Symmetry: C6
Subunit: 335 residues, 6 copies
Amino acid sequence: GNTVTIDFMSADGIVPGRTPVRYQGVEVGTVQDISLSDDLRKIEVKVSIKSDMKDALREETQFWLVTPKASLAGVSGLDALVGGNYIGMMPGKGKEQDHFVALDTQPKYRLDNGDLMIHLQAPDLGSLNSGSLVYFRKIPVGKVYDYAINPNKQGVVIDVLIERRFTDLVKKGSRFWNVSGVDANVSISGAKVKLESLAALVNGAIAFDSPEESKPAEAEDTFGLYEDLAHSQRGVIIKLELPSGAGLTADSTPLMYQGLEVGQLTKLDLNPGGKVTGEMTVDPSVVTLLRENTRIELRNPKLSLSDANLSALLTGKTFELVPGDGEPRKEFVVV
Amino acid sequence: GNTVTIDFMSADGIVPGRTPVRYQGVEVGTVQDISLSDDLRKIEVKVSIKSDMKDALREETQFWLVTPKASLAGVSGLDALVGGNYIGMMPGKGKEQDHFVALDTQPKYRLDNGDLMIHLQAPDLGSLNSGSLVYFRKIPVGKVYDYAINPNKQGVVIDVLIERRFTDLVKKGSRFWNVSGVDANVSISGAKVKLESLAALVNGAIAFDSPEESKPAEAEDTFGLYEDLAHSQRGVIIKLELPSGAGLTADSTPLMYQGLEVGQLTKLDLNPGGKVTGEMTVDPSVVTLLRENTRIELRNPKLSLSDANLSALLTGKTFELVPGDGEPRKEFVVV
Amino acid sequence: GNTVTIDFMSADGIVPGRTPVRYQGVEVGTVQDISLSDDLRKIEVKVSIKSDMKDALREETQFWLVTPKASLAGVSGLDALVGGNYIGMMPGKGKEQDHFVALDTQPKYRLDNGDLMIHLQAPDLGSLNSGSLVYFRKIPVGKVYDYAINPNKQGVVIDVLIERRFTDLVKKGSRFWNVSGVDANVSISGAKVKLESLAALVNGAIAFDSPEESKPAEAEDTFGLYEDLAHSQRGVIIKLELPSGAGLTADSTPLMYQGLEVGQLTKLDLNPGGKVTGEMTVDPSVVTLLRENTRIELRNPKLSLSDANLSALLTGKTFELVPGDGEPRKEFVVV
Amino acid sequence: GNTVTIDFMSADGIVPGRTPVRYQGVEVGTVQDISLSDDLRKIEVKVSIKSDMKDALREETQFWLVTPKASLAGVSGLDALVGGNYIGMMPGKGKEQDHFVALDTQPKYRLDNGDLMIHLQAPDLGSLNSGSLVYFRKIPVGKVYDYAINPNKQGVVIDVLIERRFTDLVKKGSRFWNVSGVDANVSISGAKVKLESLAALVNGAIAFDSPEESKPAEAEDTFGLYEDLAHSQRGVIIKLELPSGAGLTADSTPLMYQGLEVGQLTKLDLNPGGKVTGEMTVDPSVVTLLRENTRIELRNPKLSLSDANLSALLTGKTFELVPGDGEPRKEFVVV
Amino acid sequence: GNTVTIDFMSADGIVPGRTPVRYQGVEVGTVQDISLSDDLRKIEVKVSIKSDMKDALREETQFWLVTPKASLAGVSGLDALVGGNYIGMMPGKGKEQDHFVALDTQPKYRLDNGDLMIHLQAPDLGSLNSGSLVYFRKIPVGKVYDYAINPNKQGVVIDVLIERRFTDLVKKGSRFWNVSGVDANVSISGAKVKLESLAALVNGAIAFDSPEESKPAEAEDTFGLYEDLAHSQRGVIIKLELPSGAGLTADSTPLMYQGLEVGQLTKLDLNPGGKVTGEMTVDPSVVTLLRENTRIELRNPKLSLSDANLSALLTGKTFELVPGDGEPRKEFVVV
Amino acid sequence: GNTVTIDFMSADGIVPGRTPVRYQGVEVGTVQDISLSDDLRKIEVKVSIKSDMKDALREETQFWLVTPKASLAGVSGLDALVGGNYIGMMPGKGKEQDHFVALDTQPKYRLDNGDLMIHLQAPDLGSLNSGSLVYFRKIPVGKVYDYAINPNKQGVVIDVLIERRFTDLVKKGSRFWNVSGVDANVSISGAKVKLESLAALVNGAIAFDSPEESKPAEAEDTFGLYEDLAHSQRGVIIKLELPSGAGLTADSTPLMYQGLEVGQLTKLDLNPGGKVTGEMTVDPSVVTLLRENTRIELRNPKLSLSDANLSALLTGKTFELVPGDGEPRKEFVVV
């Protein structure tokens, strides 16, 4: 028998008879008695712990009360409905402490086994939460561990947790894209609505790709989080100096070649001085055609008297690529 | 043992044997006996309290009965299903009272820790309720504490509660916008429907932004609540003296420049004397172009024989900006 | 101990051992024994009551059996699942009665505190039920108490119940409008679907407005119930003698002025003798323009060769207002 | 103690110790012992009944087993979850019987009080079930009691049950229309979707109207069930001898008069001999205009060069009424 | 007491103390002891049965374990939650057996009473499952008993089970059509979405019709299952030798006559040799017009300068019927 | 009595008194005592096993803790709610082991009976999970057993499990297609939305076809998984050397013949050197027409003054087939 006092902000459903202290779900201690000091929420709770953990008890040890969490976000009261309320613990590398302060929520528990722990950078969290799932070829091979705002107030750092046997998958050249929420995909001549699976809608998801020839990533490497599969396309950035962005769309104006889609306009900017400039991603198979004296001009959706097509007039402006020869250059000027 | 009589309007599921008085979830008192006086809902309930709280018992002390609230709005009967019905208390700074009147609902409990407590002003409550969530970069960093109608009958004051470690986020120049409910976003050439996350739909939400260079806000500062992210855009108000608001829309008529969207018409008014005047927000990057002899004229969605575009004819009237030089002025007259 | 016989139409889950009589949730009586007379549903139930209520027992006292109501409409069996079935009572101003007849449902219980109790008149109930909520600035400040058909078979009288601290809100010039159900709001150039909050969809709601300068209403005053916020607009009725209601819509044909919407056609009638007459609500700011020699003529959505607008041709007929001078008149004739 | 044997097809959850026989929810008998005869589902169940019901036991007495009915259609196991399984009884006007056969379902129980019991005739049941609700001004004033196929195999007879205090409402000239299911109401220039309340969607509903001057209906009077509110319109049938039903719709082709809708084409037939004839309901206010030498001719949605209207060209064929004088006739010939 | 060993593949929640053997829900036997032989899933379960069933025990007797089936498809653990797990039995016409093998699922139980048991032939099962419902005039008068693939691998045989009192309904000339799932019904000038009731959506349904003059069907007669009400129309097949199926639709191209719809093209084929032939169902009222020298020619949706109709140009090709005289023939050639 | 120590990562709801070891649901062992070694999650759990399994205990024996899995994915805690938590086992072909390591999840249990076990190759998993269903003629005849990524990082191997009596169905020439998720099917002249049954939406499904004349498949044969029924069409691949892929769609551009649809363009490629080539599946009935001097030319949706069709102008480019004679060739060049 030992004596440990823990300060609680609020203690609900705790009886001095049967309120065990469960470390990893095994009873390690027992609540002795609950008292309050000077009526200022100073819930002094005496806890007798088995002697083996008393030797392993240190200062960096955190306690928390588990309640049946049936709230707006919560399922985690399965043990708490059966056995009742209890408290838990996590031993740490502290020196020594008798008087503890209980943590308001259950903290995140690192596991001992070798698991890949990598960070992501996103402009915002999106529809992701802790406990959401990580897919590869739509196979769950991990989950989102935690999330934290970087000290620069712009971004959000998300760190995820790959399983042990799938650490070979995450390469240095892997890209992570977001899959969360749902929309409607209406095109011309009929609409069909598919975005994601039903597991991703409620809590969020992150898919990723593994390139073929790359070194395996490790040890808290950062990655960018793209907001769509379409934004996660590989390719070569080509800067364009546009005349005027009249009918151009930020992510929907394509680059035709022989009638087929090759590139996609991705960014559209208004530089100071009145210079509308943008940039474009292309298929890497067509980069060999991108050389010197290579022209990019825009075609209008004109009303042709011989070929009356309804589909082209809905699309609008359309970038056309004609090939060239010479040194490969990476920027062009549209007249 | 002590004697405290509490008037209840209705007392349900209370037994004189086991009906504890739980202050913050720990048993402090016990219901002795329940009687009714002169058959006019005067439910005299005798309560014996432990002697330590009897010294701390004062006049401004409120009692309330907790029931399993499984009603139209309610989940909060989790403790009440397990243990049963009980009553609670909140001690206050009163002098002395023996005969109490029970409060009809559980009141709002201020916490002792340092948490930011700021007020919002809204024209109506919207789809917000107490217990709805507050996002920053879509990360929950607080919740709506309470709401109250100001003595002027026009507005609604909402006061929220930021967490302790996120008090650095709320600056003096922060803007709060509403995210609640859902709609459909139909544009031309296809429609895609995304408004908000699934947590915000049921109970409501409030997001906010943190500007980069501002003093940190504190101590019950007021803020305006914008009704949309689009209404929360920063910019410079530019007053326009319009000829006639024929095809103009209150929040959908844009300000083109080199084909790109710069401004957005925000307010449209009918002044007495037959003068249609409005005002416009602009991008702060383009304010340097707003000077003297700077003209704003409206372009019609005309049917051009060479460039037949379907997208422009659906939009309607369109404000065009041409730059000027001289002193920066903040108002213009459209002819 | 006393003896009270109560006739039940059907008595379910009642044991002679433990079936208490709960007045306001406190045990006042106990079911002694259940017998049936001559096999014609004459369920004679003997009830022993405490002596204090026996003095307060009178003739206008109603009893009812509470069952876990988990039916198509019901949540109200929360006490009945825990404790079991019981019966309740409401004492009244009767003389004396021993043999009672049990009421088939739980009756409506007036509270003792000062609460505003006002009547509404509606052409039908709509999607309102008892227990639906009453909003002011979308804040719940009351609920629908009861509803009853007036002896004239045309209308429905609904009486609601404002809270105690919000009796200042309801003025004499307040208007009550209905918010219940959901629809889709499709306009031209895209559609967005928002009608109401999620609490109003299931059970119904009623919002209201408080004008600024009015006497506070009291004591069972009547009010009209408008079926929409749009039908609850203030304004001045202007009678129109229309030539022929060809493309006119009952609530969608607007009154333009300088391109802006001022009025809205509200009623459209076919008088005998072949005279299509209607009436219109206007903005109260524009009533000063409504005088003698003030003309209202309708504009067609004509195909203009210079200004080709798609939005006007979808709208149809359009009332135009030109101002006049002289004595203010309240009716006009459209040629 | 008595002995009654009841044949069950299947007896589930019945213990010889505690399986009461509940007439109207009060224990009247007890299952003695369960045996099966010659392994052919002859579940002989001995039941001891109290002596008072033994005198009232007769031959036309039906027994049924109640189970927690949590199936595809069922909520009615609320008593059966708490107390357990039991059986019930309904005494009748038989002579004498000892060996009974249990009914496979719980039969319909007529109540003793004066309630109106009227029959409806419908071409099919629709989305109505027993236990669905009956509205008047959208107030529940009854429910569907039963339904049965008439011996002619064409129709379905539905008999409903009005409450006691609302028997004044049902008149001889009342019309009953169906409200069940949901659809979408898409018109031109925008669509809004409202059909019914949320209670009617799951189980069905029937609304009705009470005319002003009519005798009160009584005593199993029949009524027609219209399939819509629109089909329940009063009016005068006018037979039309149409030239050819080219663009005519069965329930959507209106009868204009001064641009306003007066009538509605309701039935459209192909008589033998190649004679397309139909019939029309009209507003009763306009029947005074229907006389001799009264012409009905159809107007085409023609493209007018001066009044270019998009709304008329979507509607199609349109019946026009011009008034006449003379004797009132009830049929016309369209040329 | 007796001894019966039953092989189980997996035995869950079975205690040697209280695991009864319930034939039709009455306790007939008790599990004595559970042992496993040579660790190869040979779960030897000893069962002591009452002596009366031991005489009736035969070789063709099947046993099965019932578990609370709360899985993807299942509600049937209502008895299993209350009493616990048990096993059941069905005696058969075998000789004698002591060592049994337990069936993996609960088999289908034929009832003793006279019920109609007829087979259906369908090209696939569709959205039907066992336990789905059978409607007549949308009244449930039976249910789907079982389903089995015929030895020819093309079809699916479904056998259903009509109630006892409705055996008069099923005639020899009855047609069975499928009602399962839901779609959207979009027509021109507005769309309204109604397919089926809410009970049919989850599990499936089958409706049927009873013709007036036909012999009553009996004794495992086969029937075709049509996939829609529209495919279940009666009529006369008329073969057509079409010139080229250019704008013709398989089930949507109608047969006009005097502007009214008479027939409906149902099948469209490409015979070898380049001969597009189809066949058509007609109204049986119009078969008298189908004779010799009767012409069927197709009308184009032409743009008429006098009658500009939007509805006809959306429909497309349209078959026209002109009558003829002479001998009735059943095939035609379209030029 | 025996002693077996098992390492757990976390042990939840385990009591040393009553925590049985259930092999296939029969109690085989009992948890003796729980200790932790040196505070590094070394949850040493002593287990006493019956002596018969102790002889059958070997080294390749896996243990796992079962918890009520009410998580994001979970129903499998039905036994665990009733009895409580327990652990299970699977004996294997090991030599001998005393100190075990508990498996983190319940492993997959191969059954002893003859069931077909075949592998599928898919480019990604799709919306399939383990426990999803396998249909034949929409009859459930198996389920997905497991899934695993092949060592080449491109694909995903899925192995399924056909029932015992349906092993005749799976032939060598069978094709497996995916049915999972839902979309919208909007076509011209109205839209109707049906994709799949209700079971497949939540968890996924896989349907298949059995051809008529093929050898029965067996013993871990591979199969391709097509992503749609339309992609699972049989036919003959015809390579096309297209001029320019201008209005051509990857899976929506058809091959007309006499107005009827015969083929469907399936793949469209941009070869290096600027050669847009594609390939097409055809009906096997038309392969006899595919010979030498057989021409495939594309028809435009031209505006014809005599036949004004709305349907053809929405479809776009359209491949036309004219037959030829000679040797059968399998590729063509479109000019």
